Design a protein around this ligand. Structure first.
Ligand SMILES: [Cl-]
Ligand SMILES: [Cl-]
Lengths: 222, 213
Protein backbone atom coordinates (compact mmCIF):
# COMPACT_ATOMS: atom_id res chain seq x y z
CA UNK A 1 0.00 0.00 0.00
CA UNK A 2 2.87 2.36 0.87
CA UNK A 3 4.92 0.75 -1.92
CA UNK A 4 2.56 1.84 -4.71
CA UNK A 5 1.97 5.21 -3.00
CA UNK A 6 5.66 5.81 -3.78
CA UNK A 7 5.00 4.72 -7.38
CA UNK A 8 2.31 7.39 -7.62
CA UNK A 9 4.55 10.18 -6.29
CA UNK A 10 7.43 9.36 -8.69
CA UNK A 11 5.23 10.03 -11.72
CA UNK A 12 3.34 12.90 -10.02
CA UNK A 13 6.58 14.80 -9.21
CA UNK A 14 7.41 14.96 -12.93
CA UNK A 15 3.99 16.53 -13.65
CA UNK A 16 4.36 19.29 -11.05
CA UNK A 17 4.94 22.91 -12.08
CA UNK A 18 7.36 25.33 -10.39
CA UNK A 19 5.85 26.35 -7.04
CA UNK A 20 7.62 29.69 -6.48
CA UNK A 21 5.04 32.33 -5.43
CA UNK A 22 2.17 30.01 -6.40
CA UNK A 23 -1.14 29.54 -4.54
CA UNK A 24 -1.82 25.82 -4.11
CA UNK A 25 -4.87 23.73 -3.18
CA UNK A 26 -4.45 20.13 -2.11
CA UNK A 27 -7.65 18.04 -2.16
CA UNK A 28 -7.28 15.06 0.20
CA UNK A 29 -3.94 16.14 1.64
CA UNK A 30 -3.57 13.40 4.30
CA UNK A 31 -0.33 13.87 6.28
CA UNK A 32 0.41 16.94 4.11
CA UNK A 33 3.36 15.69 2.01
CA UNK A 34 2.33 17.70 -1.09
CA UNK A 35 1.68 20.82 1.01
CA UNK A 36 5.16 20.61 2.62
CA UNK A 37 6.76 19.99 -0.79
CA UNK A 38 4.97 23.02 -2.29
CA UNK A 39 5.98 25.23 0.65
CA UNK A 40 9.69 24.32 0.54
CA UNK A 41 9.64 24.83 -3.23
CA UNK A 42 8.49 28.41 -2.70
CA UNK A 43 4.66 28.52 -2.66
CA UNK A 44 3.19 31.73 -1.24
CA UNK A 45 0.03 30.01 0.09
CA UNK A 46 -1.01 26.35 0.46
CA UNK A 47 -4.42 25.07 1.55
CA UNK A 48 -4.61 21.39 2.52
CA UNK A 49 -8.10 19.86 2.74
CA UNK A 50 -8.82 16.45 4.29
CA UNK A 51 -11.70 14.62 6.02
CA UNK A 52 -9.60 12.86 8.71
CA UNK A 53 -8.91 14.87 11.87
CA UNK A 54 -6.23 12.31 12.87
CA UNK A 55 -4.38 12.90 9.56
CA UNK A 56 -4.54 16.73 9.80
CA UNK A 57 -3.12 16.67 13.34
CA UNK A 58 -0.16 14.69 11.96
CA UNK A 59 0.00 17.10 8.99
CA UNK A 60 0.20 20.22 11.19
CA UNK A 61 2.86 18.46 13.35
CA UNK A 62 4.97 17.74 10.25
CA UNK A 63 4.54 21.20 8.69
CA UNK A 64 6.81 24.08 9.78
CA UNK A 65 5.98 26.67 7.09
CA UNK A 66 3.61 29.53 8.04
CA UNK A 67 2.53 29.42 4.35
CA UNK A 68 0.50 26.19 4.80
CA UNK A 69 -2.94 26.00 6.44
CA UNK A 70 -5.09 22.93 6.98
CA UNK A 71 -8.88 22.52 7.20
CA UNK A 72 -11.13 19.57 8.03
CA UNK A 73 -13.50 19.54 5.07
CA UNK A 74 -15.07 17.21 2.50
CA UNK A 75 -13.78 17.68 -1.06
CA UNK A 76 -17.36 18.19 -2.29
CA UNK A 77 -17.64 21.09 0.18
CA UNK A 78 -14.68 23.23 -0.93
CA UNK A 79 -15.19 26.98 -0.89
CA UNK A 80 -15.83 28.96 -4.05
CA UNK A 81 -12.84 31.28 -4.34
CA UNK A 82 -12.77 32.48 -7.98
CA UNK A 83 -9.31 32.71 -9.61
CA UNK A 84 -7.55 32.18 -6.27
CA UNK A 85 -5.33 29.21 -7.13
CA UNK A 86 -2.42 28.69 -9.51
CA UNK A 87 -2.49 24.94 -8.96
CA UNK A 88 -4.94 22.37 -7.61
CA UNK A 89 -3.56 18.92 -6.66
CA UNK A 90 -5.24 15.67 -5.57
CA UNK A 91 -3.50 12.37 -4.83
CA UNK A 92 -5.58 9.14 -4.82
CA UNK A 93 -8.78 10.85 -3.69
CA UNK A 94 -11.25 11.64 -6.52
CA UNK A 95 -12.40 8.02 -7.06
CA UNK A 96 -14.12 8.46 -3.66
CA UNK A 97 -16.15 11.36 -5.10
CA UNK A 98 -19.54 10.69 -6.77
CA UNK A 99 -19.50 13.64 -9.21
CA UNK A 100 -16.13 14.26 -10.85
CA UNK A 101 -17.97 16.80 -13.02
CA UNK A 102 -18.81 18.95 -9.92
CA UNK A 103 -15.19 18.85 -8.80
CA UNK A 104 -14.04 19.98 -12.28
CA UNK A 105 -16.53 22.88 -12.31
CA UNK A 106 -15.31 24.01 -8.89
CA UNK A 107 -11.59 23.57 -9.72
CA UNK A 108 -12.09 25.51 -12.99
CA UNK A 109 -13.68 28.44 -11.13
CA UNK A 110 -11.06 28.37 -8.32
CA UNK A 111 -8.17 28.44 -10.76
CA UNK A 112 -6.65 31.60 -12.19
CA UNK A 113 -5.91 31.93 -15.96
CA UNK A 114 -3.74 29.01 -17.15
CA UNK A 115 -4.01 27.42 -13.69
CA UNK A 116 -2.97 23.79 -13.16
CA UNK A 117 -5.04 20.77 -12.17
CA UNK A 118 -3.06 17.62 -11.51
CA UNK A 119 -4.63 14.50 -10.03
CA UNK A 120 -4.41 10.73 -9.65
CA UNK A 121 -7.17 8.18 -9.22
CA UNK A 122 -7.27 4.41 -9.00
CA UNK A 123 -7.51 3.17 -12.58
CA UNK A 124 -10.90 2.46 -14.25
CA UNK A 125 -9.50 -1.06 -14.96
CA UNK A 126 -8.80 -1.43 -11.21
CA UNK A 127 -12.35 -0.40 -10.21
CA UNK A 128 -14.39 -1.84 -13.10
CA UNK A 129 -15.14 -5.37 -11.87
CA UNK A 130 -15.63 -4.36 -8.24
CA UNK A 131 -13.79 -7.21 -6.52
CA UNK A 132 -10.57 -5.15 -6.88
CA UNK A 133 -8.43 -8.30 -6.86
CA UNK A 134 -6.84 -10.97 -9.06
CA UNK A 135 -8.71 -13.90 -10.50
CA UNK A 136 -7.22 -16.87 -8.69
CA UNK A 137 -7.25 -20.65 -9.18
CA UNK A 138 -7.50 -23.43 -6.53
CA UNK A 139 -3.79 -23.25 -5.65
CA UNK A 140 -4.06 -19.44 -5.50
CA UNK A 141 -2.10 -18.22 -8.53
CA UNK A 142 -3.07 -14.80 -9.90
CA UNK A 143 -4.21 -15.97 -13.32
CA UNK A 144 -5.17 -12.56 -14.72
CA UNK A 145 -6.91 -9.32 -13.72
CA UNK A 146 -10.70 -9.54 -14.25
CA UNK A 147 -12.55 -6.68 -15.96
CA UNK A 148 -16.36 -6.47 -15.97
CA UNK A 149 -19.12 -3.78 -15.99
CA UNK A 150 -16.68 -1.27 -17.46
CA UNK A 151 -19.37 1.14 -18.63
CA UNK A 152 -21.41 0.84 -15.42
CA UNK A 153 -20.46 4.11 -13.76
CA UNK A 154 -21.71 3.20 -10.34
CA UNK A 155 -20.51 2.82 -6.75
CA UNK A 156 -18.07 0.05 -5.92
CA UNK A 157 -18.32 -1.13 -2.32
CA UNK A 158 -15.81 -3.35 -0.52
CA UNK A 159 -16.23 -4.88 2.94
CA UNK A 160 -13.71 -5.24 5.74
CA UNK A 161 -14.36 -5.88 9.45
CA UNK A 162 -15.71 -2.59 10.83
CA UNK A 163 -15.11 -0.69 7.55
CA UNK A 164 -17.13 0.07 4.47
CA UNK A 165 -15.09 1.44 1.58
CA UNK A 166 -17.13 3.33 -1.02
CA UNK A 167 -15.62 4.22 -4.42
CA UNK A 168 -17.18 5.40 -7.71
CA UNK A 169 -16.25 3.72 -10.98
CA UNK A 170 -15.81 5.90 -14.05
CA UNK A 171 -14.28 5.17 -17.48
CA UNK A 172 -11.09 6.64 -18.96
CA UNK A 173 -13.44 8.50 -21.37
CA UNK A 174 -15.35 10.13 -18.50
CA UNK A 175 -12.19 11.43 -16.76
CA UNK A 176 -10.77 12.86 -20.01
CA UNK A 177 -14.05 14.16 -21.57
CA UNK A 178 -15.17 15.73 -18.29
CA UNK A 179 -11.95 17.74 -18.07
CA UNK A 180 -12.23 18.79 -21.75
CA UNK A 181 -15.90 19.89 -21.62
CA UNK A 182 -15.18 21.86 -18.43
CA UNK A 183 -12.56 23.97 -20.25
CA UNK A 184 -9.30 22.16 -19.45
CA UNK A 185 -6.50 21.25 -21.85
CA UNK A 186 -4.90 17.80 -21.43
CA UNK A 187 -1.11 18.04 -20.86
CA UNK A 188 -0.34 14.46 -19.80
CA UNK A 189 -2.07 11.13 -19.15
CA UNK A 190 0.05 8.46 -17.41
CA UNK A 191 -0.61 4.98 -16.08
CA UNK A 192 2.32 4.50 -13.61
CA UNK A 193 4.51 1.41 -13.65
CA UNK A 194 6.48 0.60 -10.44
CA UNK A 195 9.22 3.15 -9.59
CA UNK A 196 12.73 2.23 -10.93
CA UNK A 197 14.05 1.91 -7.35
CA UNK A 198 11.61 -0.96 -6.67
CA UNK A 199 11.27 -2.49 -10.17
CA UNK A 200 13.14 -5.66 -9.10
CA UNK A 201 11.05 -6.25 -5.93
CA UNK A 202 9.02 -9.55 -6.28
CA UNK A 203 5.72 -8.07 -5.04
CA UNK A 204 5.91 -5.31 -7.71
CA UNK A 205 5.96 -7.86 -10.57
CA UNK A 206 2.16 -8.24 -10.76
CA UNK A 207 1.92 -4.44 -11.18
CA UNK A 208 3.18 -4.71 -14.78
CA UNK A 209 0.19 -6.94 -15.57
CA UNK A 210 -2.62 -4.41 -15.05
CA UNK A 211 -2.67 -0.67 -14.29
CA UNK A 212 -3.58 0.31 -10.71
CA UNK A 213 -3.55 4.11 -11.25
CA UNK A 214 -4.46 6.92 -13.67
CA UNK A 215 -2.63 10.28 -13.47
CA UNK A 216 -3.66 13.38 -15.43
CA UNK A 217 -2.27 16.91 -15.77
CA UNK A 218 -4.53 19.64 -17.09
CA UNK A 219 -4.40 23.41 -17.70
CA UNK A 220 -7.29 25.89 -17.43
CA UNK A 221 -8.27 27.45 -20.77
CA UNK A 222 -10.72 30.35 -21.08
CA UNK B 1 -18.05 -3.49 -34.68
CA UNK B 2 -17.47 -1.83 -38.08
CA UNK B 3 -20.74 0.15 -38.24
CA UNK B 4 -20.46 1.01 -34.53
CA UNK B 5 -16.99 2.45 -35.25
CA UNK B 6 -18.41 4.75 -37.90
CA UNK B 7 -21.31 6.08 -35.77
CA UNK B 8 -18.86 7.41 -33.16
CA UNK B 9 -16.09 8.44 -35.61
CA UNK B 10 -18.60 10.47 -37.70
CA UNK B 11 -19.21 12.64 -34.61
CA UNK B 12 -15.48 13.50 -34.43
CA UNK B 13 -15.15 14.50 -38.12
CA UNK B 14 -14.64 18.21 -38.90
CA UNK B 15 -16.16 20.37 -41.65
CA UNK B 16 -14.72 18.84 -44.85
CA UNK B 17 -15.37 21.91 -47.06
CA UNK B 18 -12.27 22.60 -49.19
CA UNK B 19 -10.22 20.35 -46.91
CA UNK B 20 -7.45 18.12 -48.22
CA UNK B 21 -8.02 14.64 -46.71
CA UNK B 22 -5.88 11.49 -46.18
CA UNK B 23 -7.50 8.16 -45.27
CA UNK B 24 -5.16 5.44 -43.95
CA UNK B 25 -6.38 1.87 -44.42
CA UNK B 26 -9.32 3.09 -46.50
CA UNK B 27 -10.81 -0.38 -47.20
CA UNK B 28 -13.76 0.06 -49.57
CA UNK B 29 -13.39 3.88 -49.39
CA UNK B 30 -16.32 4.93 -47.16
CA UNK B 31 -14.51 7.91 -45.58
CA UNK B 32 -13.15 9.07 -48.93
CA UNK B 33 -16.69 9.19 -50.44
CA UNK B 34 -18.04 10.89 -47.29
CA UNK B 35 -15.38 13.63 -47.40
CA UNK B 36 -15.75 14.26 -51.15
CA UNK B 37 -19.53 14.80 -50.93
CA UNK B 38 -19.12 17.06 -47.88
CA UNK B 39 -17.06 19.50 -49.96
CA UNK B 40 -13.46 18.26 -49.90
CA UNK B 41 -11.20 19.63 -52.64
CA UNK B 42 -8.78 16.66 -52.68
CA UNK B 43 -8.83 13.20 -51.02
CA UNK B 44 -6.21 10.40 -51.04
CA UNK B 45 -7.09 6.94 -49.74
CA UNK B 46 -4.50 4.19 -49.23
CA UNK B 47 -4.75 0.46 -48.52
CA UNK B 48 -2.42 -2.56 -48.64
CA UNK B 49 -4.98 -4.92 -50.21
CA UNK B 50 -5.55 -4.77 -53.97
CA UNK B 51 -8.81 -6.78 -53.71
CA UNK B 52 -10.30 -4.14 -51.36
CA UNK B 53 -9.04 -1.24 -53.52
CA UNK B 54 -10.57 -2.81 -56.65
CA UNK B 55 -13.98 -2.69 -54.92
CA UNK B 56 -13.14 0.80 -53.55
CA UNK B 57 -12.63 2.43 -56.99
CA UNK B 58 -15.69 0.48 -58.23
CA UNK B 59 -18.05 2.10 -55.69
CA UNK B 60 -16.55 5.61 -56.00
CA UNK B 61 -17.84 8.39 -58.28
CA UNK B 62 -16.14 11.68 -57.29
CA UNK B 63 -13.00 12.82 -59.24
CA UNK B 64 -11.82 14.69 -56.12
CA UNK B 65 -10.79 11.35 -54.57
CA UNK B 66 -7.71 9.40 -55.73
CA UNK B 67 -6.62 5.93 -54.57
CA UNK B 68 -3.18 4.26 -54.26
CA UNK B 69 -1.99 0.78 -53.29
CA UNK B 70 0.33 1.44 -50.35
CA UNK B 71 1.08 0.24 -46.81
CA UNK B 72 0.44 2.70 -43.94
CA UNK B 73 4.11 2.74 -42.85
CA UNK B 74 5.18 3.74 -46.40
CA UNK B 75 3.05 6.91 -46.84
CA UNK B 76 4.65 9.73 -48.80
CA UNK B 77 6.22 12.70 -47.07
CA UNK B 78 4.22 15.67 -48.30
CA UNK B 79 4.79 18.66 -45.96
CA UNK B 80 1.78 20.87 -45.08
CA UNK B 81 -0.44 19.08 -47.62
CA UNK B 82 -3.40 17.80 -45.59
CA UNK B 83 -6.12 19.31 -43.41
CA UNK B 84 -7.30 15.97 -42.05
CA UNK B 85 -5.82 12.47 -41.62
CA UNK B 86 -8.14 9.55 -40.78
CA UNK B 87 -7.52 5.95 -39.77
CA UNK B 88 -10.26 3.45 -38.92
CA UNK B 89 -9.21 0.31 -36.94
CA UNK B 90 -5.76 0.09 -38.48
CA UNK B 91 -3.02 1.53 -36.30
CA UNK B 92 -2.94 -1.41 -33.83
CA UNK B 93 -1.53 -3.46 -36.76
CA UNK B 94 1.39 -1.00 -37.09
CA UNK B 95 4.54 -1.54 -35.00
CA UNK B 96 5.64 2.09 -34.57
CA UNK B 97 2.82 4.47 -33.70
CA UNK B 98 5.54 7.09 -33.05
CA UNK B 99 6.64 6.89 -36.70
CA UNK B 100 3.06 7.35 -37.93
CA UNK B 101 2.71 10.43 -35.67
CA UNK B 102 5.97 11.96 -36.96
CA UNK B 103 4.85 11.61 -40.57
CA UNK B 104 1.24 12.74 -39.95
CA UNK B 105 2.47 15.85 -38.10
CA UNK B 106 4.71 16.71 -41.09
CA UNK B 107 1.93 15.94 -43.62
CA UNK B 108 -0.68 18.10 -41.82
CA UNK B 109 -1.22 21.85 -42.06
CA UNK B 110 -1.60 24.17 -39.05
CA UNK B 111 -4.57 23.18 -36.85
CA UNK B 112 -5.19 20.10 -39.02
CA UNK B 113 -6.76 17.03 -37.40
CA UNK B 114 -5.58 13.46 -36.87
CA UNK B 115 -8.61 11.32 -36.03
CA UNK B 116 -8.24 7.58 -35.51
CA UNK B 117 -9.60 4.40 -33.96
CA UNK B 118 -7.82 1.28 -32.68
CA UNK B 119 -8.68 -1.85 -30.72
CA UNK B 120 -8.64 -0.86 -27.06
CA UNK B 121 -5.50 -1.72 -24.98
CA UNK B 122 -7.81 -3.74 -22.66
CA UNK B 123 -8.90 -5.90 -25.63
CA UNK B 124 -5.27 -6.44 -26.72
CA UNK B 125 -3.38 -6.72 -23.38
CA UNK B 126 -3.76 -10.39 -22.47
CA UNK B 127 -3.39 -11.59 -26.06
CA UNK B 128 -6.15 -14.22 -26.11
CA UNK B 129 -8.62 -11.51 -27.21
CA UNK B 130 -11.58 -13.43 -25.77
CA UNK B 131 -13.52 -13.79 -22.50
CA UNK B 132 -12.62 -16.00 -19.58
CA UNK B 133 -15.02 -18.90 -19.49
CA UNK B 134 -15.69 -21.68 -17.14
CA UNK B 135 -16.00 -25.26 -18.13
CA UNK B 136 -19.50 -24.73 -19.26
CA UNK B 137 -18.99 -21.64 -21.43
CA UNK B 138 -20.44 -18.79 -19.46
CA UNK B 139 -18.54 -15.58 -20.13
CA UNK B 140 -17.30 -14.83 -16.61
CA UNK B 141 -15.37 -11.58 -17.14
CA UNK B 142 -12.77 -10.15 -19.48
CA UNK B 143 -9.16 -11.05 -18.65
CA UNK B 144 -6.41 -8.43 -18.49
CA UNK B 145 -2.75 -9.40 -18.28
CA UNK B 146 0.69 -8.07 -19.40
CA UNK B 147 -0.80 -4.56 -19.81
CA UNK B 148 2.57 -2.79 -19.74
CA UNK B 149 4.14 -5.38 -22.03
CA UNK B 150 4.10 -3.47 -25.30
CA UNK B 151 4.93 -5.94 -28.01
CA UNK B 152 3.36 -8.16 -30.66
CA UNK B 153 0.19 -10.11 -30.07
CA UNK B 154 -0.15 -12.99 -32.54
CA UNK B 155 -3.29 -14.99 -33.17
CA UNK B 156 -3.42 -18.18 -35.24
CA UNK B 157 -6.02 -19.51 -37.64
CA UNK B 158 -5.83 -22.12 -40.37
CA UNK B 159 -3.76 -20.49 -43.08
CA UNK B 160 -3.17 -17.15 -41.32
CA UNK B 161 -1.17 -15.45 -38.62
CA UNK B 162 -2.67 -12.19 -37.39
CA UNK B 163 -0.12 -9.70 -36.03
CA UNK B 164 -1.23 -6.89 -33.73
CA UNK B 165 0.82 -4.58 -31.53
CA UNK B 166 -0.36 -3.98 -27.97
CA UNK B 167 0.11 -0.46 -26.62
CA UNK B 168 -1.19 1.18 -23.43
CA UNK B 169 -3.63 4.13 -23.20
CA UNK B 170 -0.58 6.15 -22.01
CA UNK B 171 1.39 5.30 -25.18
CA UNK B 172 -1.35 6.44 -27.60
CA UNK B 173 -1.97 9.67 -25.68
CA UNK B 174 1.65 10.59 -24.74
CA UNK B 175 3.01 9.86 -28.22
CA UNK B 176 0.47 12.26 -29.78
CA UNK B 177 1.40 14.82 -27.11
CA UNK B 178 5.20 14.52 -27.56
CA UNK B 179 4.92 14.84 -31.35
CA UNK B 180 3.03 18.16 -31.11
CA UNK B 181 -0.65 17.20 -31.10
CA UNK B 182 -3.39 18.60 -28.87
CA UNK B 183 -5.90 16.07 -27.50
CA UNK B 184 -9.48 17.13 -28.44
CA UNK B 185 -11.49 14.00 -27.61
CA UNK B 186 -10.88 10.48 -26.23
CA UNK B 187 -13.85 8.09 -26.49
CA UNK B 188 -14.34 4.40 -25.65
CA UNK B 189 -17.54 3.59 -27.53
CA UNK B 190 -20.40 1.38 -26.39
CA UNK B 191 -22.72 -0.14 -29.02
CA UNK B 192 -26.22 1.22 -29.74
CA UNK B 193 -27.36 -11.26 -30.72
CA UNK B 194 -23.89 -11.12 -29.09
CA UNK B 195 -23.70 -7.37 -28.61
CA UNK B 196 -25.14 -8.22 -25.16
CA UNK B 197 -21.69 -8.69 -23.62
CA UNK B 198 -20.10 -5.60 -25.29
CA UNK B 199 -21.23 -3.25 -22.50
CA UNK B 200 -18.98 -5.16 -20.07
CA UNK B 201 -15.52 -4.27 -21.41
CA UNK B 202 -14.16 -1.68 -23.86
CA UNK B 203 -13.43 -2.88 -27.37
CA UNK B 204 -12.18 0.20 -29.16
CA UNK B 205 -10.31 3.42 -28.48
CA UNK B 206 -11.03 6.60 -30.48
CA UNK B 207 -8.83 9.69 -30.34
CA UNK B 208 -9.19 13.09 -32.07
CA UNK B 209 -6.10 15.31 -32.14
CA UNK B 210 -5.13 18.66 -33.72
CA UNK B 211 -1.71 19.77 -35.02
CA UNK B 212 -0.01 22.43 -32.91
CA UNK B 213 2.97 24.47 -34.12
CL1 LIG C 1 -18.72 12.62 -13.01
CL1 LIG D 1 5.01 3.35 -30.79
Amino acid sequence: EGLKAAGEWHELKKMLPDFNQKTVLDLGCGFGWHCIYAAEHGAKKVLGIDLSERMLTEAKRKTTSPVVCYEQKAIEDIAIEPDAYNVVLSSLALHYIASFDDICKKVYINLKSSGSFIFSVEHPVFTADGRQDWYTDETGNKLHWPVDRYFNESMRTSHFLGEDVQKYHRTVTTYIQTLLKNGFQINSVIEPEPAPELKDLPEMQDEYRRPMMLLISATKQE
